[PDB]
């Protein structure tokens, strides 16, 4: 348990230091492109692109703070991050969903409604992401659980093209034990919470698989 | 004919000084966003918006050079220009169509293929505009005819909200005679060319009516 306590603490901290809590942010809104859905708003997409890029870097930073991650080859580290980064982005933004206003909040406090999220870059996947956000709510996840779930999604020994898939599996094992024990201790009354949480990775993958294939437009650059 | 000759001269000149000939321009291309059709490319949309705005200003300038236009009330001038500007933009870009490459050329020389024109801002109207461009070719229009046609489209006494529609009708009359005589003298062997040219204004209207109601995205300044 002490080795498990240490791991949970390290993973909670890794998540917290790379992802502000909604309560820690100064939420601000905008009236820009709120009237109707359009294929893209250029102002919102510029901001969304900027913020997403930063969150990718923060997710990289998060990975480096996970015990053992940097002992993998650089190739394997890039391979793992390429495969899971969008899945982590989706989970991250969905943890900043506010059900009463139907908004998501970015790490600078930018708070956008469903139509604005559509126009910022969610596009045809808007309702799918928002359904997922709403489905997270009953889980009542805390930072340690969000961080552990992120870590489990990332440190996956079944990714294509791993040089040392055995070593990746080895790193994942304690994360699974860590989440299982933590979830059990936190809510002894709700025994299926652990598998329910784990299965959310499948839902992230349904979305990210569609998202990854999208041809996007950027400044050149 | 002396007064008709001088009207044709004034209108040809008005067109030429506000719209460079394809042969007067340095054509240049880009590989940007040529691979497939997308909803919007932000770089091409930026350039397209910039060039379109400039061409609107040039079309206002064109109008001011038309005999009698500035004698109308400022209200009527704006009313006519609001009603016809997009129609004139469509005609203008279609006169810079190069069938062998399936390209259109803007007033700085920028030369984009069909897919690039789609991604620059034509969007779902791309094939409609290109069909119109192709249907222009058999007409073999020169500067005088393009300018007179633009002028007839603009100076229309049946636009709703005109303060002095009679005065507008008065200004249109000589432009119609001017085109009729000019087309007849230019190609006496082809007597339906005059009405065929006039009816292109209807085709312009089919496109502009759809285009005008499109919700576009712009930067917040």
């Amino acid at each position: 348990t002490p080795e498990v306590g240490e791991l949970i603490e390290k993973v909670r901290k890794a998540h917290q230091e790379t992802f502000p809590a909604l309560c820690q942010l100064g939420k601000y809104t905008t009236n820009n492109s709120s009237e109707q859905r359009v294929s893209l708003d250029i102002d919102l997409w510029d901001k969304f692109s900027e913020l997403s890029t930063k969150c990718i870097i923060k997710t990289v930073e998060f990975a480096k703070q996970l015990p053992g991650f940097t002992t993998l080859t650089i190739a394997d580290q890039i391979t793992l991050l390429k495969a899971a980064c969008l899945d982590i982005l989706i989970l991250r933004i969905c943890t900043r969903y506010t059900p009463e206003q139907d908004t998501m909040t970015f790490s600078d406090g930018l708070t956008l409604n469903r139509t604005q999220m559509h126009n910022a870059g969610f596009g045809p996947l808007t309702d799918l992401v928002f359904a997922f956000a709403n489905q997270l709510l009953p889980l009542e996840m805390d930072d340690a659980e969000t961080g552990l779930l992120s870590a489990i999604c990332l440190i996956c020994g079944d990714r294509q093209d791993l040089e040392q898939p055995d070593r990746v599996d080895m790193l994942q094992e304690p994360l699974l034990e860590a989440l299982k024990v933590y979830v059990r201790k936190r809510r002894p009354s709700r025994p299926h919470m652990f598998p329910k949480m784990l299965m959310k990775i499948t839902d992230l993958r349904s979305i990210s698989a569609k998202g990854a294939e999208r041809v996007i437009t950027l400044k050149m650059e | 004919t002396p007064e008709v000759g001088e009207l044709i001269e004034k209108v040809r000149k008005a067109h030429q000084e506000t719209f460079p000939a394809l042969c007067q321009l340095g054509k240049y291309t880009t590989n940007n966003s040529s691979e497939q059709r997308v909803s919007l490319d932000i770089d091409l949309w930026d350039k397209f918006s910039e060039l379109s705005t400039k061409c609107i200003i040039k079309t206002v300038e064109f109008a001011k050079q038309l005999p009698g236009f500035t004698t109308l009330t400022i209200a009527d001038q704006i009313t006519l220009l609001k009603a016809a500007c997009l129609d004139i933009l469509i005609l203008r870009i279609c006169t810079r169509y190069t069938p062998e490459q399936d390209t259109m050329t803007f007033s700085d020389g920028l030369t984009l293929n069909r897919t690039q024109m789609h991604n620059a801002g034509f969007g779902p109207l791309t094939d409609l505009v290109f069909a119109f461009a192709n249907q222009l070719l058999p007409l073999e229009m020169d500067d005088a005819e393009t300018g007179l046609l633009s002028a007839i489209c603009l100076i229309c006494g049946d636009r709703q909200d005109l303060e002095q529609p009679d005065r507008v009708d008065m200004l249109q009359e000589p432009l119609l005679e001017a085109l009729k005589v000019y087309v007849r003298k230019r190609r006496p062997s082809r007597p339906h060319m005059f009405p065929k040219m006039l009816m292109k204004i209807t085709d312009l209207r089919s496109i502009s009516a759809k285009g005008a109601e499109r919700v576009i995205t712009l930067k917040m300044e």
């Binding site: 870097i57 996007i216 950027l218 | -």
Partner: peptide
């Protein structure tokens, strides 16, 4: 310019590991 999201993500991550 056009790019798939997957290729853009890969680019951001690869450049971040550059030394």
């Amino acid at each position: 310019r056009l790019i798939t999201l997957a290729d853009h993500i890969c680019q951001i991550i690869t450049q971040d590991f550059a030394r």
